[PDB]
Write a protein that binds this ligand. Structure first.
Ligand SMILES: Cc1ncc(C[n+]2csc(CCOP(=O)(O)OP(=O)(O)O)c2C)c(N)n1
Ligand SMILES: Cc1ncc(C[n+]2csc(CCOP(=O)(O)OP(=O)(O)O)c2C)c(N)n1
Ligand SMILES: [Mg+2]
Ligand SMILES: [Mg+2]
Lengths: 532, 536
């Protein structure tokens, strides 16, 4: 019993819970894409461009575990590179499959360019090794949580392989740690906890996706050591935990936090990216690296002895934050510093919260999350326009995990323009995210760094409210809000709290308005001779 | 008396007739960017994304000789790269300047801060990473010359800590040398002698004007060769506009096996092909390239077409002395009149466009049905075609239109920029309409609404999902992007098309316009349709 190599790839992806395939059709992938619709429960998103398709891929993978984007030779694959690169930077497992031609010259140039931002690459040439090659690409995507480049010649896709190949699972397991090296780490780490009187735990972004979110809460529960998140790790620790201290942003952490960490005699850095760092692939203790000793197992073994070594530690108190705003008049103009606190009131368990590079990125580090809130903020790579695509991907994946689950984007009016057309494919699929667009008449974060009045921080002014209908939506909500009362009236409306249709909320804000600790930040950077 | 290195760059670009700077700000190009407003007659376009900026740089450079796009380290430059690659493939001169960090974010987490430089190196004529103030001016000059003269993208990395260090303003008083080194005499003479020999012995010579005809400054030469020989003269789809189509010896477009039967036969029956501005039946092909000439398998590298043609022209008439001119093919240039209710079909429309165009028009056509349809449209003289046939990146024309319009504005405001784009292609880059609106640019945007990717439907999966698109309201694009002064209309019929395109108000570029051209989903130019049906 015989299937196409095409069908084999999608059946493989299906087995790793990848239901939606991103990308755009072209000459060298059309035959491959047919196979999607021979595997039940699979779909082609039909993206509005390849850059957006890769951002969506990224989004999808963050929620689902990995993703797949298919493009065409040259024109397709090159359009996606900034997306791929961001996935590489932030450790998101995205399989990039390029349909290529049959098997200035140099048909390999694009393959070499993607090698730079890929964990591994394959150019399938051989119908007989192709199944193992696909399998190795998927494993590597999943386990390494980095993009993988798979070139698939258009003449091999509809060549057939034994269906019973699908009956051996792909091995998604980590290879264990060298016990001796691992025992060394544990030994040392345990010594450091025995000495220290005031350790903190720092959760970085890797908690969620590498499943050490569960190990991280147990370390907290067993130590009662205070626990903070980086902007990227925000959501990794449920924020209603007594020992949650808040978001460590370094120089920009609210004062309590800033010193709270800095005052610590031992830092246990988890998912990181007298200090101990647990990374997915290795760990480091003070200066000494320890390659191969993986956080999953390392941390597992640590939990079994952590109580013992922390016997004596007296739980240090932790930063509270002004959970709620004050009442003010209904006519009060919206300000960023009011909005990110108020956004707390609106979030629920199970929400996916996505914040664009800009004010939104800083803003959300001031918002209280309920438990089981999945944060997405691309603080390392920092490519504006990311979040539009990422919203689509996340909304697909959240659809397949749990329909209840709400997708909430905060995007600047600037950032929206780069990737605006991907709203289209949200609509075509009847996805129902909350698109909060921060209209501050341009690039306010840059206005905050250089050229308050420079023309390159000005943007063409769009009619946000008409985006949805223009892109062909027949069942939607678009609304503008400028005041406290307008915000409250919309967001405490129970109708509105139900992810019942795609919504665009245009949030009218001053041009120079910003979260207070971005504000001060540049009050500090513009008065200083510290420079680049 | 000193200027910043940043100012130096924009002053050098002004000297080479680059007035409009493409890109997006960020991170490490901000204080470079300020310098633009310090040079009179310069502007920052303010593109809606880096991909579209690159395509725009491409469009601009095609009209103005060369262009400049500025992006930011990592996020900016990787976004542009598909545009950069098309410019490299189609031999368009874009200088890509990337504001880079001083010599920890938008980083791949790895160590390699040169990684993006290396990726761009594969699609650049040359690169410079600038680190030394002392050679900074000369490096910039070399980058500019290289872009202009090789007509291919150049990568120029500009650390932030150098852009506001000063250099002597007097450096600008030495022009950048943009002339070609004269040919090798020995080589050029062997070329000439040979071409002349072939031309003597040819019974059915033909001239083929490919893509590099206009762009490498050879349109006049090519026309003088037609004039002095009277050989039949055909264009490639890429070359179209290279030869003014009112010339009696103009026989049409050679689209190989998708030609008209007369054109196919007229070209393939030739015993000598004089090909001009190729970027690469019978053996006797002479290729005149920018950089080299090729006669059969024989290559003469560094024998440039500009000068080599100029020499050929001084003897060619003697060689062609005993030529007897063959009558050339022509497409009927007019549709037979029909009822005003006749719904629009591609075959009718590509001929009709013919009745609309006028001298000085820039015609831009997107990959898909338009690129193929445009090949049956008769052009007026001095019509500049843009059709990215080799690289074939859909969406391109949305940026390229912006870029062309800027360049057109700067050359002659009366000049019309006319885009045929598919509904499909428009989605990839729709937003750059915003940038046109911003600058009060006034292209015609013909959007062919055939309800998806028709060229794909024709080749594979007629009704497949991946050939379907979300249906947009094309008439609301303009007001949604903030247009205050514009026109937007839908045409479904011949009468409707005639009504709009013969209208006094329509025929001057007094504002930006969107024409939604409603076409059946499986409708295409007959060449293409006699292909799907034939090679099912
Ligand atoms: C692809 C890309 N281009 C440019 C930048 C540089 N950049 C960083 S923030 C920003 C402006 C964001 O504007 P907006 O989204 O309107 O946010 P605001 O600060 O106004 O809320 C830009 C242009 C980037 N990070 N990525
Ligand atoms: C960047 C890029 N993506 C995808 C492709 C593959 N491709 C070529 S033509 C086409 C569809 C064109 O459809 P449309 O613009 O609506 O033109 P039509 O044929 O319908 O006139 C696609 C997807 C490509 N060449 N470049
Ligand atoms: Mg903004
Ligand atoms: Mg179409």
């Amino acid at each position: 019993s015989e299937i196409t190599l095409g069908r084999y790839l999608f059946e493989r992806l299906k087995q790793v819970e990848v239901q939606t395939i991103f990308g755009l059709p072209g000459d060298f992938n059309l035959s491959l894409l047919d196979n999607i619709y021979e595997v039940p429960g699979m779909r082609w998103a039909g993206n509005a461009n390849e850059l957006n398709a890769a951002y969506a891929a990224d989004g999808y993978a963050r929620l689902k575990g990995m993703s797949c984007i298919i493009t065409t030779f040259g024109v397709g694959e090159l359009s996606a590179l900034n997306g791929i690169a961001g996935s590489y930077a932030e450790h998101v497992g995205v399989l990039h499959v390029v349909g290529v031609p049959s098997v200035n010259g140099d048909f390999t140039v694009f393959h070499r360019m993607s090698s730079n931002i890929s964990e591994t690459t394959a150019m399938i040439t051989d119908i007989n090794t192709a199944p193992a090659e696909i399998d190795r690409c998927i494993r590597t995507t999943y386990v390494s949580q980095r993009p993988v480049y798979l070139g698939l010649p258009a003449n091999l896709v509809d060549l057939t392989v034994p269906a019973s190949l699908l009956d051996t699972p792909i091995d998604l397991s980590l290879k264990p740690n060298d016990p001796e090296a691992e025992e060394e780490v544990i030994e040392n780490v345990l010594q450091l906890i025995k000495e220290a009187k005031n350790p903190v735990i720092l959760a970085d972004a890797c908690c969620s996706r590498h499943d050490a979110k569960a190990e991280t809460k147990k370390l907290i529960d067993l130590t009662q050591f205070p626990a903070f998140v980086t902007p990227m790790g925000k959501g990794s620790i449920d924020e209603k935990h007594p020992r949650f201290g808040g978001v460590y942003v370094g120089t920009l952490s609210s004062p309590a936090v800033k010193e709270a960490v800095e005052s610590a005699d031992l830092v246990l850095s988890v998912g990181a990216l007298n200090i101990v760092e647990f990374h997915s692939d290795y760990t480091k203790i003070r200066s000494a690296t320890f390659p191969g000793v993986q956080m999953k197992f390392a941390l597992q073994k640590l939990l079994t002895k952590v109580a013992d070594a922390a016997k004596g530690y007296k739980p240090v108190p932790v930063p509270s934050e002004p959970e709620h705003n004050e009442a003010v008049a209904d006519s009060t103009p919206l300000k960023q510093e009011w909005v990110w606190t108020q956004v707390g009131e609106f979030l629920r368990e199970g929400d996916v919260v996505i914040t664009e590079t800009g004010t939104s990125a800083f803003g959300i580090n001031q918002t209280h999350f309920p438990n089981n809130t999945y944060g997405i903020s691309q603080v390392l790579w920092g490519s504006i326009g990311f979040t539009t695509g990422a919203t689509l991907g996340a909304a697909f994946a959240a659809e397949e995990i749990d329909p209840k689950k709400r997708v909430i984007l905060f995007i600047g009016d600037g950032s929206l323009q780069l990737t605006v057309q991907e709203i289209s494919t949200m609509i075509r699929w009847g996805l129902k995210p909350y698109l909060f667009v921060l209209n501050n008449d341009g690039y306010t974060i840059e206005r905050l760094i250089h050229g308050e009045t420079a023309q390159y921080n000005c943007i063409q002014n769009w009619q946000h409210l008409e985006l949805l209908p223009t892109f062909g939506a027949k069942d939607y909500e678009a609304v503008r809000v400028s005041t406290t009362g307008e915000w409250n009236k919309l967001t405490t409306d129970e109708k509105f709290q139900d992810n019942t249709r795609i919504r665009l909320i245009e949030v009218m804000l001053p041009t120079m308005d910003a979260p207070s600790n971005l504000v001060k930040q540049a009050q500090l950077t513009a008065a200083t001779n510290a420079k680049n």
